Scaffold this motif. Structure first.
Motif, PDB file in Angstrom:
ATOM      1  N   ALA A 116       0.825  -1.197   0.000  1.00 34.92           N
ATOM      2  CA  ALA A 116       0.000   0.000   0.000  1.00 34.92           C
ATOM      3  C   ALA A 116       0.867   1.258   0.000  1.00 34.92           C
ATOM      4  CB  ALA A 116      -0.934   0.004   1.204  1.00 34.92           C
ATOM      5  N   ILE A 117       0.203   2.409  -0.146  1.00 34.44           N
ATOM      6  CA  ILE A 117       0.907   3.689  -0.170  1.00 34.44           C
ATOM      7  C   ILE A 117       1.471   4.011   1.206  1.00 34.44           C
ATOM      8  CG2 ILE A 117       0.675   6.139  -0.673  1.00 34.44           C
ATOM      9  CD1 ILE A 117       0.567   4.458  -3.093  1.00 34.44           C
ATOM     10  N   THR A 118       0.693   3.750   2.253  1.00 32.10           N
ATOM     11  CA  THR A 118       1.145   3.891   3.630  1.00 32.10           C
ATOM     12  C   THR A 118       1.688   2.582   4.191  1.00 32.10           C
ATOM     13  OG1 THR A 118       0.433   4.505   5.860  1.00 32.10           O
ATOM     14  CG2 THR A 118      -1.245   3.574   4.367  1.00 32.10           C
ATOM     15  N   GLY A 119       2.294   1.759   3.337  1.00 32.42           N
ATOM     16  CA  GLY A 119       2.741   0.426   3.696  1.00 32.42           C
ATOM     17  C   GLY A 119       3.936   0.336   4.620  1.00 32.42           C
ATOM     18  N   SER A 120       4.619  -0.810   4.603  1.00 32.38           N
ATOM     19  CA  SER A 120       5.564  -1.096   5.670  1.00 32.38           C
ATOM     20  C   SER A 120       6.845  -1.765   5.181  1.00 32.38           C
ATOM     21  CB  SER A 120       4.913  -1.972   6.739  1.00 32.38           C
ATOM     22  OG  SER A 120       4.571  -3.241   6.213  1.00 32.38           O
ATOM     23  N   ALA A 121       7.322  -1.410   3.967  1.00 37.05           N
ATOM     24  CA  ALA A 121       8.645  -1.762   3.438  1.00 37.05           C
ATOM     25  C   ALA A 121       8.949  -3.260   3.430  1.00 37.05           C
ATOM     26  CB  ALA A 121       9.732  -1.023   4.218  1.00 37.05           C
ATOM     27  N   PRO A 122       8.451  -4.023   2.434  1.00 34.76           N
ATOM     28  CA  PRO A 122       8.505  -5.496   2.487  1.00 34.76           C
ATOM     29  C   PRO A 122       9.897  -6.117   2.517  1.00 34.76           C
ATOM     30  CG  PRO A 122       8.030  -4.778   0.281  1.00 34.76           C
ATOM     31  CD  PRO A 122       8.040  -3.536   1.111  1.00 34.76           C
ATOM     32  N   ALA A 123       9.955  -7.439   2.693  1.00 30.75           N
ATOM     33  CA  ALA A 123      11.184  -8.147   3.031  1.00 30.75           C
ATOM     34  C   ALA A 123      12.186  -8.136   1.881  1.00 30.75           C
ATOM     35  CB  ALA A 123      10.877  -9.589   3.428  1.00 30.75           C
ATOM     36  N   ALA A 124      13.442  -8.405   2.222  1.00 28.62           N
ATOM     37  CA  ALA A 124      14.557  -8.187   1.319  1.00 28.62           C
ATOM     38  C   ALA A 124      14.716  -9.341   0.336  1.00 28.62           C
ATOM     39  CB  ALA A 124      15.847  -8.002   2.106  1.00 28.62           C
ATOM     40  N   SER A 125      15.547  -9.104  -0.678  1.00 32.91           N
ATOM     41  CA  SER A 125      15.880 -10.095  -1.689  1.00 32.91           C
ATOM     42  C   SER A 125      17.141  -9.649  -2.413  1.00 32.91           C
ATOM     43  CB  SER A 125      14.743 -10.279  -2.691  1.00 32.91           C
ATOM     44  OG  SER A 125      14.535  -9.088  -3.421  1.00 32.91           O
ATOM     45  N   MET A 126      17.873 -10.619  -2.954  1.00 34.50           N
ATOM     46  CA  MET A 126      19.017 -10.365  -3.820  1.00 34.50           C
ATOM     47  C   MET A 126      19.027 -11.390  -4.942  1.00 34.50           C
ATOM     48  SD  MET A 126      22.260  -9.352  -1.421  1.00 34.50           S
ATOM     49  CE  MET A 126      22.250  -7.870  -0.429  1.00 34.50           C
ATOM     50  N   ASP A 127      19.978 -11.241  -5.856  1.00 39.39           N
ATOM     51  CA  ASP A 127      20.232 -12.294  -6.824  1.00 39.39           C
ATOM     52  C   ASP A 127      21.116 -13.374  -6.221  1.00 39.39           C
ATOM     53  OD1 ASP A 127      18.717 -11.574  -9.028  1.00 39.39           O
ATOM     54  OD2 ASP A 127      20.313 -10.356  -9.906  1.00 39.39           O
ATOM     55  N   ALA A 128      21.525 -14.304  -7.071  1.00 42.34           N
ATOM     56  CA  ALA A 128      22.447 -15.357  -6.698  1.00 42.34           C
ATOM     57  C   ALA A 128      23.384 -15.617  -7.861  1.00 42.34           C
ATOM     58  CB  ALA A 128      21.703 -16.637  -6.317  1.00 42.34           C
ATOM     59  N   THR A 129      24.661 -15.802  -7.552  1.00 44.40           N
ATOM     60  CA  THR A 129      25.660 -16.207  -8.527  1.00 44.40           C
ATOM     61  C   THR A 129      26.174 -17.587  -8.154  1.00 44.40           C
ATOM     62  OG1 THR A 129      27.374 -15.074  -7.287  1.00 44.40           O
ATOM     63  CG2 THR A 129      26.299 -13.868  -9.054  1.00 44.40           C
ATOM     64  N   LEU A 130      26.407 -18.420  -9.160  1.00 48.10           N
ATOM     65  CA  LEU A 130      26.696 -19.824  -8.936  1.00 48.10           C
ATOM     66  C   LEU A 130      27.984 -20.217  -9.648  1.00 48.10           C
ATOM     67  CD1 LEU A 130      23.114 -21.308  -9.332  1.00 48.10           C
ATOM     68  CD2 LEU A 130      24.296 -20.648  -7.261  1.00 48.10           C
ATOM     69  N   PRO A 131      28.666 -21.277  -9.189  1.00 50.05           N
ATOM     70  CA  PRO A 131      29.923 -21.682  -9.835  1.00 50.05           C
ATOM     71  C   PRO A 131      29.724 -22.695 -10.951  1.00 50.05           C
ATOM     72  CG  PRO A 131      30.023 -21.868  -7.455  1.00 50.05           C
ATOM     73  CD  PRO A 131      28.595 -21.796  -7.819  1.00 50.05           C
ATOM     74  N   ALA A 132      30.802 -23.146 -11.615  1.00 54.64           N
ATOM     75  CA  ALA A 132      30.641 -24.273 -12.538  1.00 54.64           C
ATOM     76  C   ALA A 132      31.680 -25.381 -12.374  1.00 54.64           C
ATOM     77  CB  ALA A 132      30.665 -23.748 -13.960  1.00 54.64           C
ATOM     78  N   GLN A 133      32.949 -25.021 -12.179  1.00 55.94           N
ATOM     79  CA  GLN A 133      34.070 -25.808 -11.654  1.00 55.94           C
ATOM     80  C   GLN A 133      34.712 -26.868 -12.556  1.00 55.94           C
ATOM     81  OE1 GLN A 133      35.422 -25.128  -8.610  1.00 55.94           O
ATOM     82  NE2 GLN A 133      33.936 -23.479  -8.360  1.00 55.94           N
ATOM     83  N   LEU A 134      34.052 -27.309 -13.647  1.00 56.55           N
ATOM     84  CA  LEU A 134      34.534 -27.823 -14.946  1.00 56.55           C
ATOM     85  C   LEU A 134      35.946 -28.426 -14.960  1.00 56.55           C
ATOM     86  CD1 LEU A 134      35.247 -27.631 -18.274  1.00 56.55           C
ATOM     87  CD2 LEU A 134      32.977 -28.170 -17.429  1.00 56.55           C
ATOM     88  N   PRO A 135      36.179 -29.598 -14.371  1.00 53.90           N
ATOM     89  CA  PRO A 135      37.554 -30.005 -14.038  1.00 53.90           C
ATOM     90  C   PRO A 135      38.330 -30.663 -15.168  1.00 53.90           C
ATOM     91  CG  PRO A 135      36.029 -31.620 -13.233  1.00 53.90           C
ATOM     92  CD  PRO A 135      35.186 -30.554 -13.859  1.00 53.90           C
ATOM     93  N   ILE A 136      39.631 -30.347 -15.243  1.00 55.27           N
ATOM     94  CA  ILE A 136      40.605 -31.213 -15.915  1.00 55.27           C
ATOM     95  C   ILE A 136      41.995 -31.295 -15.297  1.00 55.27           C
ATOM     96  CG2 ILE A 136      40.054 -31.863 -18.249  1.00 55.27           C
ATOM     97  CD1 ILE A 136      41.773 -28.496 -17.806  1.00 55.27           C
ATOM     98  N   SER A 137      42.247 -32.357 -14.534  1.00 53.00           N
ATOM     99  CA  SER A 137      43.541 -33.041 -14.589  1.00 53.00           C
ATOM    100  C   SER A 137      43.274 -34.488 -14.184  1.00 53.00           C
ATOM    101  CB  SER A 137      44.570 -32.388 -13.679  1.00 53.00           C
ATOM    102  OG  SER A 137      44.150 -32.455 -12.333  1.00 53.00           O
ATOM    103  N   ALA A 138      42.866 -35.307 -15.145  1.00 55.62           N
ATOM    104  CA  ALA A 138      42.647 -36.706 -14.819  1.00 55.62           C
ATOM    105  C   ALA A 138      43.194 -37.654 -15.869  1.00 55.62           C
ATOM    106  CB  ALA A 138      41.158 -36.970 -14.611  1.00 55.62           C
ATOM    107  N   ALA A 139      43.036 -37.306 -17.143  1.00 53.93           N
ATOM    108  CA  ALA A 139      43.215 -38.280 -18.205  1.00 53.93           C
ATOM    109  C   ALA A 139      43.842 -37.617 -19.418  1.00 53.93           C
ATOM    110  CB  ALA A 139      41.888 -38.940 -18.580  1.00 53.93           C
ATOM    111  N   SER A 140      44.199 -38.451 -20.392  1.00 51.66           N
ATOM    112  CA  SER A 140      44.979 -38.045 -21.548  1.00 51.66           C
ATOM    113  C   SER A 140      44.897 -39.136 -22.603  1.00 51.66           C
ATOM    114  CB  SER A 140      46.436 -37.809 -21.157  1.00 51.66           C
ATOM    115  OG  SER A 140      47.203 -37.478 -22.293  1.00 51.66           O
ATOM    116  N   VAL A 141      44.752 -38.737 -23.874  1.00 48.01           N
ATOM    117  CA  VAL A 141      44.740 -39.675 -24.995  1.00 48.01           C
ATOM    118  C   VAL A 141      46.169 -39.865 -25.493  1.00 48.01           C
ATOM    119  CG1 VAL A 141      42.367 -39.265 -25.656  1.00 48.01           C
ATOM    120  CG2 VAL A 141      44.095 -37.761 -26.493  1.00 48.01           C
TER     121      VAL A 141
END
Lengths: 50, 49
Positions: free
Chosen positions: A6-31
């Motif tokens: 409402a116009i005379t309301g009460s400042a609703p609850a907070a929120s943010m975005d989220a950033t996430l990893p990927a981690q994509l590994p290589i040191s295991a194998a070889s042709v």
């Protein structure tokens, strides 16, 4: 989030975005590949092939 | 108790006498050749006419 209060309301609850990893590994194998050629096979094929 | 009895040193002399027989006599006159090939092939002629 962006909610409607409402116009005379009460400042609703907070929120943010989220950033996430990927981690994509290589040191295991070889042709790979091997030969195992002799030292006399390389000699008689320098005079017996056209 | 001799003054130099255990402080002797055993020194061999320059008299090596090799007594084995390693003789390559027939190999020493064959006129050695190289061969970088699989096998030697040559021709031998017979009769027939």
């Amino acid at each position: 989030t962006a909610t409607g209060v409402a116009i005379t309301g009460s400042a609703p609850a907070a929120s943010m975005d989220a950033t996430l990893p990927a981690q994509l590994p290589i040191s295991a194998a070889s042709v790979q590949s091997t030969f195992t050629l002799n030292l006399k096979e390389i000699e008689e094929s320098k005079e017996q092939v056209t | 108790a001799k003054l130099n009895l255990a402080v002797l040193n055993n020194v061999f002399s320059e008299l090596l006498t090799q007594e084995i027989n390693r003789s390559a006599t027939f190999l020493g006159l064959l006129s050695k050749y190289p061969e970088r090939k699989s096998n030697i092939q040559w021709g031998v002629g017979m009769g027939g006419t």
